[PDB]
Amino acid sequence: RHSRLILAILAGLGSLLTAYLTYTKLTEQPAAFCTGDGGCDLVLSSRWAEFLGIPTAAVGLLGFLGVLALAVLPDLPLVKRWRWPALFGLVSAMTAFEMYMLYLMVAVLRQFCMYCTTAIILVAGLGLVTVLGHRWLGGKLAFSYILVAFLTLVTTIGVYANQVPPPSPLAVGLAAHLRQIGGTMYGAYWCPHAQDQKELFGAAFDQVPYVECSPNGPGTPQAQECTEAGITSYPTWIINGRTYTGVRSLEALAVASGYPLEEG
Numbered sequence: 001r002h003s004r005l006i007l008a009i010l011a012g013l014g015s016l017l018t019a020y021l022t023y024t025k026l027t028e029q030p031a032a033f034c035t036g037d038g039g040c041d042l043v044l045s046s047r048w049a050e051f052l053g054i055p056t057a058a059v060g061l062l063g064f065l066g067v068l069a070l071a072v073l074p075d076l077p078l079v080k081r082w083r084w085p086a087l088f089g090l091v092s093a094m095t096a097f098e099m100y101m102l103y104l105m106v107a108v109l110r111q112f113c114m115y116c117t118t119a120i121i122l123v124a125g126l127g128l129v130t131v132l133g134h135r136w137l138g139g140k141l142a143f144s145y146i147l148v149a150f151l152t153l154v155t156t157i158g159v160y161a162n163q164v165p166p167p168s169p170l171a172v173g174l175a176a177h178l179r180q181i182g183g184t185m186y187g188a189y190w191c192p193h194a195q196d197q198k199e200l201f202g203a204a205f206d207q208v209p210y211v212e213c214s215p216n217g218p219g220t221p222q223a224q225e226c227t228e229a230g231i232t233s234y235p236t237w238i239i240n241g242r243t244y245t246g247v248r249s250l251e252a253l254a255v256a257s258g259y260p261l262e263e264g
Contacts, residue, residue, distance in 0.1 A: 006129050007071040014064035014122045021057035021115055032246030034193050035233040040113040046192045048104060052159060063094050067126065084134045089148055095127045096149035100156055167202035170250045175207035177259045184209040186226050187235035190218055194235040197247045
């Protein structure tokens with residue numbers, strides 16, 4: 001009944017899973033077109049999936065390997081004393097992080113991925129076992145959980161807000177300039193690279209002419225307006241008759257739109 005063997009197994013599965021995703025995220029032949037995703041890459045490769053300069057999966061790797069090591073180590077310095085309180089800290093942080101991950105899928109991304117879902121259940125499995133695999137005689141644990149979860153959520157949310165650069169100085173003027181010449185952006189709301197392009201403008205993207213190519217969602221035939229323009233992939237810029245496909249920096253969009261970049 002009392003066992004840390006299951007922790008090593010669940011953390012073992014977790015370590016393989018999250019290590020494989022790093023490999024897919026790391027090898028990752030780079031692309032912007034994202035022409036073809038049913039799928040899972042649509043949820044996955046969302047910025048949100050990068051954390052502090054490294055893949056989110058690599059963070060879970062530090063975690064899943066962390067919990068594994070605490071379970072495997074024999075009771076050595078500082079282990080018997082700090083083993084189980086450090087397990088409740090690390091796992092609590094992992095559950096909290098996951099509930100935010102779960103929140104992103106259901107609410108903001110409105111989609112799912114089986115790799116990501118398996119990790120939740122693995123961590124939910126870790127949370128149950130850690131609670132029922134040691135004796136700490138009560139209200140301490142319920143409070144220690146909220147403390148760690150709170151610190152985790154604040155740090156997590158804080159990083160994903162400090163993740164994006166705010167409006168570039170060129171951004172504001174360009175957006176108004178494209179609005180005048182009718183430089184339009186064709187893309188989707190689910191499209192991760194459209195989000196990347198959106199984030200390069202910031203709040204100034206309100207000014208940018210944007211056509212939703214698929215209002216109904218993924219898997220559905222794209223809207224008429226985009227089909228008339230021959231849009232095969234997202235995002236796609238049409239500026240002064242010219243066609244530019246993929247994410248473009250503010251500098252490159254300014255060149256296409258004829259927006260003066262003066263430094264003299």
